[PDB]
């Protein structure tokens, strides 16, 4: 929530729903990266 809260302020019309805006959402995102599923997308967004 620090490093990536806000920060997905891209001007694209696509959705990046696994983001780190709230606390419920951040928690869901952290868990998804533990199940391993699609964590590369959550990392690519943190680099862009």
């Amino acid at each position: 929530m620090q490093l990536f809260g806000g920060r997905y302020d891209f001007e694209d019309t696509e959705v990046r729903r696994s983001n780190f805006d709230n606390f419920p959402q951040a928690l869901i995102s952290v868990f998804q990266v533990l199940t391993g599923e699609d964590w590369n997308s959550v990392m690519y967004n943190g680099i862009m």
């Binding site: 806000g6 997905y8 302020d9 891209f10 001007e11 694209d12 019309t13 959705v15 805006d21 709230n22």
Partner: protein
């Protein structure tokens, strides 16, 4: 270097040589003599320009009142008809039969959507519509993203189907009527007569995105003018997808605005700045809006949100009252995502009585709280609109006119006033046109006042076009000379009718399109702007014309006579023309109509020929087999009779003209006698010249071709070999040189063009012209313009015999007013003939202006095309320079110095003509450039707007403004 008396004596033997060559070979005094020899084939009547204007002002009154009556009945039927509609929802049971525009008309298709049934119509081809049309029913336009077959749309096509009987009753009564259309609140439009729409949806690959609600005609009659003020939220949270959406809504919101509407754009993030250079509400014309749409785009989001400084700045903007203002609906709309503060305190005082209306827009996909924003909208009698997407922008930034129309629909009959739109290009390609609108109201159960829940919206708006070619038939210019014309004007300064006004849209800025970012097959929007050229931009501006222009915006009558300079037809000359203006109001409308005449045009010739043999004998004069002893005759495409049409191929036209007089006597019971007759009289006057004078002197030595461009269209170039090179417009009221010959009292020389295509130099030659000038009973007349194309080679020999052919000591040239190069000593200059002299030695030309020998005026042409700049054609502004003698003095001696050199130039002006002779030392002796002073349409982006609007042009707004009815619902958001 020869003395000033030697140049004086040597000019006087070669202006005496050109003028004697032109006075003798053309036949000025002979054509004067035969207009005066007859006296009785014609009579001389006056142009009473008080009377003519009054007569014209009334045909546009009656035209635009006749349009109005039709509009009123359609509206009554629509109101009555929909009050008796039942709102059914069984439409697969009872089909709605209608013809849908923008659908394949191929019989074998048979799509047959549920609820609806189409029509295959039969489509005759037509005139007054330049497209195939059906007079048996009305077409229906559904916009593309709107589904048809929706109960909301299916129920319009049911009740609106009773308009086809009233549509038909308007055209039966008046054949000339143009499109008749009802634009629905629902977004469905029906027009008569039916024709296929110009863009089908998917049968080509361009797709129309046309919405009736969006249209300017629909908007002006939807609602009253308005001073809006866009707030933009620029806090940090907005940055992202949401910030991207806002820049496209505001641009979209503006499209909605009109000239009568004033608008500024502010933006807040813990301080409210204003987005551009303006700081007050500005007129929201094509230009101002272009500035605001160019500053909305560069915005960057950063900082804390403050709705208190954002609405303080907004209210203060709303209260300026020093500036020019709409003063009608005052509304402020804020684009923002989420608000935690309702700003209750700012609204208590700034708008305690709710004079202002607040509209809040929540944009993008986000989690910020929308309750406070909704509350603000509810408190202020505004509305709330979400926009998550780009496809949601187009119907929510046009939808606020449903709110602003409410206190108009509570005004009753008082609100049913016809209003006429600014000239604009028709959706169907008709040409320039204006539409008169009326709003239809939803009255259901009026008898008993039963509901009113949705009875505060308009059903839609009804319009009817007038084409500007219909108004130009009520303002006839043939009796008057080429110089005379009629100008029409808004109470906004825009010109309804003008010679200068053109079909191309008025352009703003220098067009820049990026080729690296246009994917090839997507079809962007083309244009929708109105063609708002102003009177002080259609003509060269004076101070004695801003007096005339203001004086006929505020509905006064008058005359005025003064000396002003006319810009030439081609954009190269400026001629001081003593004009008289005369204006009066069109009493039914807010247009005021004027008329320019040049003193000497106060009298015209009417043909008074009626004998059997005399109209006969003059008519075989214009036979194309008889051009071996007459001269390659031309003829102007007037609307002589209704049957023979202007063709743009002139040999085509002159056969169809001259067939017409053989196959039928010129009495012609559906055809004006005077126009054809004058032409016949004229052709017997440009015959007796070509028989008894020009065919005697069959070859003059330096003379190439000899013409008589006359009034009656009949231009006669004398050898048929020469008439192939005659590259003029055959309409005599469009020729540039014809009009410059009438202003001047001396022989006029026209410079040939530089480069280009076609033979226009050695082959045809430089031409001299001169208006014929007769006096009948002490009444001045200038019926015709004689002329000569000169031979450039012979002229050189006389000129050569202290200037040699190719001299290195000094060079001399002859320049007509305007500074164009006609004759050159060197032979590296006479190759580039007809070229602006400041492009071949820019150092001397620059000095000449300084000496006061030459004067100039740069103007703006707001309707021109140009290639784009990287940052096939768009419209753009060009700046145009013309040059003209401002000093009457005959000679000008001096020296110019570049730095380290002197050149001694001597300038003498030939008497009795526009030509000037200058002697100067060879350019090669002093190697000098300054910069190349060029005279061309030069792309530019001026004048800057931010400085015009600090002192705007005078203007007069609409008298009736409907807003703030006390019994408005003000409860739905």
């Amino acid at each position: 270097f020869p003395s000033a008396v030697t140049i004086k004596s040597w000019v006087d033997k070669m202006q005496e040589d050109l003028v004697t060559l032109a006075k003798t070979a053309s036949g000025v005094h002979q054509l004067v003599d035969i207009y005066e020899k007859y006296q009785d084939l014609y009579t001389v009547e006056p142009n009473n320009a008080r009377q003519l204007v009054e007569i014209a002002a009334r045909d546009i009154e009656k035209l635009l009142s006749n349009r109005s009556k039709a509009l009123v009945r359609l509206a009554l039927e629509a109101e009555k008809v929909q009050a008796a509609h039942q709102w059914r929802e069984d439409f697969a049971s009872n089909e709605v039969v209608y013809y849908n525009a923008k659908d394949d008309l191929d019989p074998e298709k048979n799509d047959s959507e549920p609820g609806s049934q189409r029509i295959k119509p039969v489509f005759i081809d037509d005139a007054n519509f330049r497209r195939q049309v059906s007079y048996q029913h009305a077409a229906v336009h559904i916009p593309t993203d709107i589904y048809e077959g929706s109960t909301i749309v299916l129920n319009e096509l049911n009740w609106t189907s009773a308009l086809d009987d009233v549509f038909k009753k308007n055209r039966e009564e008046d054949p000339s009527l143009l499109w008749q259309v009802f634009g629905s609140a629902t977004g469905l439009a029906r027009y008569y007569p039916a024709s296929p729409w110009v863009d089908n949806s998917r049968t080509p690959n361009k797709i129309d995105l046309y919405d009736v609600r969006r249209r300017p005609w629909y908007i002006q009659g939807a609602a009253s003018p308005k001073d809006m003020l866009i707030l933009v939220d620029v806090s940090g949270s907005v940055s992202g997808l949401t910030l991207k959406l806002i820049r496209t809504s505001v641009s979209e919101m503006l499209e909605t605005l009109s000239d009568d509407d004033f608008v500024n754009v502010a933006s807040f993030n813990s301080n409210a700045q204003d987005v551009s250079c303006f700081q007050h509400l500005v007129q929201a014309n094509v230009r101002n809006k272009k500035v605001l749409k160019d500053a909305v785009n560069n915005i960057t989001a950063k900082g804390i949100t403050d709705y208190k400084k954002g609405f303080s700045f907004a209210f203060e903007q709303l209260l300026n009252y020093n500036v020019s203002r709409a003063n009608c609906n005052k509304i402020i709309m804020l684009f923002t995502d989420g608000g935690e503060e309702r700003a209750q305190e700012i609204f208590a005082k700034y708008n305690k009585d709710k004079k202002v209306r607040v509209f809040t827009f929540s944009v993008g996909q986000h989690n910020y709280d929308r309750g406070p924003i909704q509350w603000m909208a509810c408190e202020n009698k505004g509305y709330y609109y979400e926009i998550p997407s780009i496809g949601a922008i187009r119907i929510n930034t046009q939808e606020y006119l449903d709110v602003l129309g409410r206190p108009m629909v509570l005004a009753g009959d008082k609100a049913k006033q016809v209003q006429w739109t600014n000239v604009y290009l028709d959706a169907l390609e008709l040409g320039l046109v204006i539409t008169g609108t009326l709003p239809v109201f939803n009255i259901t159960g009026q008898f008993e006042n039963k509901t009113n829940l949705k009875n505060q919206l308009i059903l839609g708006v009804m319009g009817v076009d007038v084409s500007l070619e219909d108004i130009k038939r009520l303002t006839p210019r043939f009796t008057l000379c080429p110089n005379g014309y009629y100008f029409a004007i808004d109470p906004n300064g825009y010109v309804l009718l003008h010679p200068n006004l053109q079909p191309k849209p008025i352009g703003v800025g220098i067009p820049t399109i990026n080729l690296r970012k246009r994917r090839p097959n997507v079809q962007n929007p083309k244009s929708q702007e109105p063609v708002t050229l102003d009177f002080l931009d259609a003509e060269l501006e004076n101070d004695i014309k801003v007096e005339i222009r203001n004086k006929m915006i505020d509905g006064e009558s008058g005359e005025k006579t003064f000396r002003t300079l006319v810009k030439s037809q081609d954009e190269r000359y400026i001629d001081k023309g003593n004009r008289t203006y005369t204006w009066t109001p069109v009493n039914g409308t807010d247009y005021s109509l004027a008329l320019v005449l040049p003193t000497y045009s106060f009298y015209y010739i009417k043909a008074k020929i009626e004998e059997t043999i005399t109209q006969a004998r003059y008519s075989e004069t214009l036979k194309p087999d008889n051009f071996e002893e007459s001269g390659y005759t031309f003829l102007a495409p007037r609307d002589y009779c209704s049957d023979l049409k202007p063709s743009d191929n002139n040999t085509e036209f002159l056969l169809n003209f001259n067939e017409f007089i053989d196959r039928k006597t010129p009495n012609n019971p559906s055809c004006n006698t005077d126009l054809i007759n004058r032409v016949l009289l004229d052709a017997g006057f440009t015959n007796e010249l070509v028989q008894n004078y020009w065919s005697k002197q069959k070859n003059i030595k330096g003379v190439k071709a000899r013409f008589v461009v006359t009034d009656g269209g009949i231009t006669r170039v004398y050898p048929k070999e020469a008439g192939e090179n005659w590259q003029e417009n055959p309409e005599t009221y469009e020729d540039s040189f014809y009009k410059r010959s009438l202003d001047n009292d001396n022989y006029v020389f026209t410079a040939p063009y530089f480069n280009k295509s076609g033979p226009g130099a050695y082959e045809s030659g430089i031409m001299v012209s001169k208006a014929v000038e007769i006096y009948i009973q002490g009444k001045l007349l200038k019926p015709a313009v004689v002329g000569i194309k000169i031979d450039v080679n012979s002229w050189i020999e006389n000129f050569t015999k202290d200037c040699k052919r190719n001299s290195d000591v000094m060079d001399c040239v002859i320049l007509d007013d305007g500074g164009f190069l006609l004759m050159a000593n060197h032979d590296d200059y006479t190759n580039q003939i007809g070229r602006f002299f400041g492009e071949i030695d820019p150092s001397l030309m620059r000095h000449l202006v300084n000496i006061s020998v030459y004067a100039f005026n740069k103007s703006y042409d707001y309707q021109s095309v140009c290639e784009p700049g990287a940052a096939s054609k768009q419209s753009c502004i060009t700046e145009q320079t013309q040059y003209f003698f401002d000093n009457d003095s005959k000679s000008f001696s001096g020296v110019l110095d570049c730095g380290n050199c002197s050149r001694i130039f001597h300038v003498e002006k030939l008497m009795n003509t526009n030509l000037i002779f200058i002697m100067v030392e060879s350019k090669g002796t002093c190697p000098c450039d300054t910069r190349l002073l060029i005279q061309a349409e030069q792309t530019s982006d001026g004048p800057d707007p931010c400085d015009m609007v600090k002192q705007p042009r005078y203007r007069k707004g609409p008298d009736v403004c409907f807003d703030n009815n006390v019994l408005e619902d003000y409860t739905d958001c």
